[PDB]
Amino acid sequence: TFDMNRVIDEFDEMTRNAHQVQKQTLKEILLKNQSAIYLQNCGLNGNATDPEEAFKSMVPLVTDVELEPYIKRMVDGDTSPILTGHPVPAISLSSGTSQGRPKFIPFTDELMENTLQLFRTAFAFRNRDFPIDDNGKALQFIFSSKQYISTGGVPVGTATTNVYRNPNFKAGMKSITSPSCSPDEVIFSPDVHQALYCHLLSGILFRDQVQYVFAVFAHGLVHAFRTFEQVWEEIVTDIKDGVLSNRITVPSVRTAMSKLLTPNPELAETIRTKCMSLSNWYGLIPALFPNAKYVYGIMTGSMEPYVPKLRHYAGDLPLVSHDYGSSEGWIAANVTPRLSPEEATFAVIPNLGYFEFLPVSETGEGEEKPVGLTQVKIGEEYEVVITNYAGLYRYRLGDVVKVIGFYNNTPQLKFICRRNLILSINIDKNTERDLQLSVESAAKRLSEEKIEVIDFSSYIDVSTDPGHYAIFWEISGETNEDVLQDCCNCLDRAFIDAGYVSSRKCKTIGALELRVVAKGTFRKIQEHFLGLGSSAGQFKMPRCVKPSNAKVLQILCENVVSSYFSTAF
Amino acid sequence: LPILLDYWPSMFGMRARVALREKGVEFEYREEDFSNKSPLLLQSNPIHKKIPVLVHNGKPVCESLNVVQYVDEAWPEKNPFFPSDPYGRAQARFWADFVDKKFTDAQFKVWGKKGEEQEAGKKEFIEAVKILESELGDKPYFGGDSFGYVDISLITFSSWFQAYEKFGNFSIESESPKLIAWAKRCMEKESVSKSLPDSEKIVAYAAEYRKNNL
Amino acid sequence: LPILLDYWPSMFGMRARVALREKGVEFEYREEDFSNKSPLLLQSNPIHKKIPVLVHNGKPVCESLNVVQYVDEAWPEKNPFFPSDPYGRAQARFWADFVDKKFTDAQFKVWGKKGEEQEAGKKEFIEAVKILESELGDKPYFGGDSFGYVDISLITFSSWFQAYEKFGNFSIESESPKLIAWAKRCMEKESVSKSLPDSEKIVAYAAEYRKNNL
Numbered sequence: 001t002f003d004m005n006r007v008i009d010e011f012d013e014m015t016r017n018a019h020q021v022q023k024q025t026l027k028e029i030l031l032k033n034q035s036a037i038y039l040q041n042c043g044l045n046g047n048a049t050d051p052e053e054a055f056k057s058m059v060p061l062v063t064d065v066e067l068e069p070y071i072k073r074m075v076d077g078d079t080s081p082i083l084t085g086h087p088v089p090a091i092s093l094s095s096g097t098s099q100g101r102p103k104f105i106p107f108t109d110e111l112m113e114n115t116l117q118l119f120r121t122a123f124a125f126r127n128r129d130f131p132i133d134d135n136g137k138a139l140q141f142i143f144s145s146k147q148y149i150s151t152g153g154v155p156v157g158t159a160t161t162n163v164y165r166n167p168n169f170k171a172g173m174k175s176i177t178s179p180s181c182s183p184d185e186v187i188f189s190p191d192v193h194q195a196l197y198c199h200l201l202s203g204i205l206f207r208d209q210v211q212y213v214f215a216v217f218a219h220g221l222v223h224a225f226r227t228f229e230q231v232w233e234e235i236v237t238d239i240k241d242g243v244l245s246n247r248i249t250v251p252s253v254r255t256a257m258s259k260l261l262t263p264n265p266e267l268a269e270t271i272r273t274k275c276m277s278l279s280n281w282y283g284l285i286p287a288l289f290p291n292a293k294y295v296y297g298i299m300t301g302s303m304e305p306y307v308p309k310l311r312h313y314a315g316d317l318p319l320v321s322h323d324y325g326s327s328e329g330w331i332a333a334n335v336t337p338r339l340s341p342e343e344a345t346f347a348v349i350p351n352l353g354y355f356e357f358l359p360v361s362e363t364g365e366g367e368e369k370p371v372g373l374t375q376v377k378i379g380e381e382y383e384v385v386i387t388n389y390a391g392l393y394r395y396r397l398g399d400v401v402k403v404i405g406f407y408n409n410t411p412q413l414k415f416i417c418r419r420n421l422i423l424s425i426n427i428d429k430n431t432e433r434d435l436q437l438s439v440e441s442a443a444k445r446l447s448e449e450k451i452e453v454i455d456f457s458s459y460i461d462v463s464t465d466p467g468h469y470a471i472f473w474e475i476s477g478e479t480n481e482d483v484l485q486d487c488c489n490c491l492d493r494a495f496i497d498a499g500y501v502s503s504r505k506c507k508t509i510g511a512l513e514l515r516v517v518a519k520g521t522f523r524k525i526q527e528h529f530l531g532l533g534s535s536a537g538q539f540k541m542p543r544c545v546k547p548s549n550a551k552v553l554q555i556l557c558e559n560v561v562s563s564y565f566s567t568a569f
Numbered sequence: 570l571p572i573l574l575d576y577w578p579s580m581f582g583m584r585a586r587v588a589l590r591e592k593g594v595e596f597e598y599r600e601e602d603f604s605n606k607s608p609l610l611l612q613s614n615p616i617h618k619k620i621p622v623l624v625h626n627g628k629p630v631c632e633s634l635n636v637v638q639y640v641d642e643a644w645p646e647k648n649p650f651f652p653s654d655p656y657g658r659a660q661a662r663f664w665a666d667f668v669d670k671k672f673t674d675a676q677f678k679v680w681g682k683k684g685e686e687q688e689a690g691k692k693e694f695i696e697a698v699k700i701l702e703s704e705l706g707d708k709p710y711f712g713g714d715s716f717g718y719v720d721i722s723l724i725t726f727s728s729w730f731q732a733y734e735k736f737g738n739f740s741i742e743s744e745s746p747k748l749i750a751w752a753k754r755c756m757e758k759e760s761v762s763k764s765l766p767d768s769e770k771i772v773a774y775a776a777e778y779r780k781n782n783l
Numbered sequence: 784l785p786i787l788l789d790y791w792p793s794m795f796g797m798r799a800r801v802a803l804r805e806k807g808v809e810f811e812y813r814e815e816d817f818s819n820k821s822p823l824l825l826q827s828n829p830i831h832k833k834i835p836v837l838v839h840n841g842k843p844v845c846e847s848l849n850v851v852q853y854v855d856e857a858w859p860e861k862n863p864f865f866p867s868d869p870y871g872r873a874q875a876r877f878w879a880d881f882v883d884k885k886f887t888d889a890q891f892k893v894w895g896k897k898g899e900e901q902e903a904g905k906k907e908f909i910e911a912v913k914i915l916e917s918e919l920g921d922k923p924y925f926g927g928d929s930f931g932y933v934d935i936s937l938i939t940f941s942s943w944f945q946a947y948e949k950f951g952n953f954s955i956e957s958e959s960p961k962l963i964a965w966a967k968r969c970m971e972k973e974s975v976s977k978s979l980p981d982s983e984k985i986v987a988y989a990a991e992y993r994k995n996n997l
């Protein structure tokens with residue numbers, strides 16, 4: 001039961017018992033998770049009166065290459081469990097790569113508890129600073145429109161997808177948020193760009209009731225508001241007649257909107273005047289919802305360049321920076337959210353995992369051994385090492401943090417940029433360039449429609465006979481199939497290398513499938529990643545999916561607006 | 570500075586622009602109101618009054634394929650569209666003449682006319698794209714080992730492919746895919762990726778044409 | 784030896800002959816029966832089966848101006864049909880196609896029709912005759928300072944001039960002394976003196992054609 005005062009005091013206690021809970025989290029994670037096979041590798045049995053020291057002495061550091069094969073055996077037909085407690089309910093990916101190729105991280109229900117308690121706490125502090133009407137609504141550019149099942153019959157899911165479709169999502173979130181304006185069907189629509197379009201429409205639906213405008217990411221926000229500049233007259237024509245634009249095709253979404261559509265010529269008059277009055281769309285968000293206390297999301301590092309344009313759209317409204325952590329592990333929440341993006345910091349929550357930090361101090365890399373979270377030196381920068389319920393134990397995400405200060409007994413951390421980069425040779429290539437050739441080459445036939453490809457990915461399906469590349473697109477708008485079928489042919493025709501020639505012609509691995517998905521998919525991925533919270537480097541998206549890769553994978557198949565197997569050959 | 574007399578949906582005007590931009594010329598485009606055919610145009614071809622017209626040394630150069638070999642011969646040092654042999658030249662010319670006859674009239678039939686006229690044109694164009702697909706065989710292009718003469722000739726028809734797909738209510742791709750397939754291949758050339766206007770508008774002009782003459 | 788698959792009454796057969804003979808090349812002429820086409824002809828001309836087709840070194844060349852251009856390009860060592868300049872060539876190709884379409888369409892209206900279309904064709908052919916006259920002036924040829932590429936394309940119609948005066952009931956000599964006299968100069972050369980069949984034969988055929996087909 002969400003109460004501002006008890007949760008904050010409790011969190012305060014938690015912050016001041018930060019050292020205790022970190023410890024207790026380590027003992028409890030290991031008890032809960034004692035039987036993991038790498039633990040036999042180190043020699044652990046659990047408990048006793050020397051548990052914490054023994055854990056650090058016995059358990060060595062791990063890279064993506066060491067973790068990828070193991071939990072690879074977890075997902076694909078071997079439903080066999082590997083490193084925390086049971087077999088996993090979901091499956092993940094990490095930005096940047098494991099030697100140029102897919103990385104994976106496990107998912108548990110506890111991460112859902114982590115989410116629900118974290119948002120409870122974060123909402124409270126922010127609601128303390130920005131008090132809301134509990135009878136209002138809010139504009140959330142948020143999706144979980146897609147769930148597919150892996151080759152072994154095990155769900156493989158993004159952070160968006162496993163929260164929002166989680167059986168406990170609705171009841172746990174109802175008490176700590178303003179109800180999303182759009183129906184669950186739109187959020188989970190097979191056609192998200194149009195559903196985002198109806199999401200714009202949706203927050204637009206309950207404007208006065210809207211307390212805040214929420215997207216995980218500021219680039220998400222700029223995307224939406226630039227798109228606004230694009231489509232404001234079409235929306236006004238659509239909503240006015242009581243008939244949505246014929247652009248919109250998927251039936252479930254069509255039914256929901258049809259439940260909401262009847263002719264009203266009146267407001268069209270109001271909108272053409274208001275939208276025409278704007279200056280280069282300055283202060284777009286206050287214009288739309290004059291009374292939103294804040295625009296909410298991560299405003300630092302990679303998203304810092306998009307925040308001013310969003311500021312341009314948000315006017316003089318404050319951009320409130322969101323918390324810092326993920327299914328890989330939650331570290332911090334913003335407990336002074338009124339702080340500006342330039343001065344924004346995040347205070348670590350210590351019950352979600354046992355975290356450690358590798359010193360960079362010396363020159364390069366540093367080769368110093370790690371100290372405790374509260375043992376960190378103020379002012380200096382460290383790489384976060386992760387032990388938790390996410391299947392990573394003393395794991396190097398590969399990421400640099402700064403200690404701005406202590407919020408009571410917990411550290412405040414600050415982050416600049418997006419790049420956690422050392423890279424290797426992939427085997428999902430078809431080098432980044434050639435694959436990029438494939439997207440760009442197929443994209444011009446989308447271009448004749450005045451559309452550019454905003455992003456893209458690919459997957460190797462070894463379930464089928466013959467296996468097949470699946471190419472995925474995030475694009476600006478809806479169009480017809482004939483061109484997208486043409487598309488897929490070009491992606492086949494763009495993969496320059498000969499290897500592709502023998503098989504695809506010989507069909508030993510099958511026809512490439514162009515599964516066309518809608519807006520924000522790759523955004524949700526970036527949302528996931530800079531929101532990973534261990535990190536300053538999280539913005540690099542894996543281009544082609546090995547069996548291992550799973551973030552892009554979750555959002556991939558059902559959200560396919562249209563999917564095609566080449567009618568070529 | 571080469572002065573071109575063009576028409577936003579001229580597939581032939583596009584043959585010119587694609588040819589010139591493929592070569593390496595900076596040139597100027599002037600859009601025509603064929604209701605009011607220009608003083609300089611009416612002096613370029615006072616009888617056809619037809620474009621594309623590239624103007625060089627103050628000498629009007631006319632007709633689309635004429636203009637593109639004009640493109641070859643005007644800057645003969647960098648990007649040749651033909652190969653070295655005379656026979657290969659004759660083959661590419663052969664096939665540009667192909668592009669220009671049953672192919673153009675058939676598309677003209679599929680977006681320009683209807684009914685008894687329509688299906689004649691529809692099988693004609695599918696027959697066309699099939700002999701076409703057969704001679705493409707394997708080649709990245711057509712008129713040589715690289716971007717070619719007739720590459721320029723028939724690439725510019727692939728923004729009307731959308732028009733054909735819709736009025737014909739067809740899909741020229743399950744019957745002959747490697748062609749359209751080759752087309753969005755040839756779109757990556759900066760010569761056609763900036764010379765050719767959008768297909769939704771081209772589709773709409775076919776729609777304006779149709780709505781006018783029913 | 785070069786292989787010519789041809790039809791003796793066809794003007795376009797004759798341009799293959801004029802270009803080949805103008806050069807000095809020795810070739811074998813094969814008279815084709817449209818009712819019973821040669822094996823070589825189906826293989827040489829699968830798509831349109833139209834004469835003449837020249838087989839050289841086992842590669843086929845088809846259509847009218849193209850065979851002439853191939854002939855000029857295949858044997859560039861002696862007498863060149865085109866000008867060295869791109870632009871002059873430009874003019875030639877323009878004028879050659881000019882003779883092949885509009886002059887030729889009105890041309891088919893001359894020997895191949897009756898009634899008001901005949902009247903139309905007659906208006907059209909004398910006028911384009913006048914503009915052929917316009918481009919000319921007081922000179923022997925067309926394509927070059929000697930016998931040229933456009934001369935090649937148009938001189939073959941001179942065998943058919945007797946039919947056009949005949950069926951046209953018009954005075955090409957009186958209105959256009961220049962074109963006919965241009966025809967008789969070209970006739971002075973063995974290239975036309977031995978490639979153009981007796982006009983009596985084609986002139987008889989055309990009438991026989993008229994009688995036979997409605």
Ligand SMILES: Nc1ncnc2c1ncn2[C@@H]1O[C@H](COP(=O)(O)OP(=O)(O)OP(=O)(O)O)[C@@H](O)[C@H]1O
Nearest residue numbers: 090091092107111157158159162163325326327328
């Ligand atoms: N940063 C975050 N943003 C959103 N949800 C998160 C986040 N971190 C943890 N979660 C919870 O984790 C839940 C599911 O993410 P989940 O672990 O299933 O994805 P995964 O692919 O299996 O792992 P990962 O998200 O780390 O790549 C998510 O549904 C969400 O509720």
Ligand SMILES: N[C@@H](CCC(=O)N[C@@H](CS)C(=O)NCC(=O)O)C(=O)O
Nearest residue numbers: 579581603618619620632633634669
């Ligand atoms: N086949 C011709 C195409 C010529 C043609 O069809 N021209 C049309 C434009 S597509 C035209 O100019 N019409 C003149 C007018 O309508 O004013 C060529 O070789 O280019």
Ligand SMILES: N[C@@H](CCC(=O)N[C@@H](CS)C(=O)NCC(=O)O)C(=O)O
Nearest residue numbers: 790793795817833834835846847848
């Ligand atoms: N495309 C050929 C045209 C040749 C031609 O018209 N030949 C005549 C033979 S008299 C013909 O095709 N008649 C049509 C037929 O027999 O169906 C060329 O350029 O030479």
Ligand SMILES: CC/C=C/C[C@H]1C(=O)CC[C@@H]1CC(=O)O
Nearest residue numbers: 115119216322323324325531532
């Ligand atoms: C806790 C519930 C949702 C997860 C948090 C996410 C948002 O909803 C906004 C940014 C943030 C990204 C991140 O911290 O993972």
Ligand SMILES: CC(C)C[C@H](N)C(=O)O
Nearest residue numbers: 159160216524527528531
């Ligand atoms: C709101 C969150 C579910 C977004 C999340 N960071 C993701 O895209 O995975």
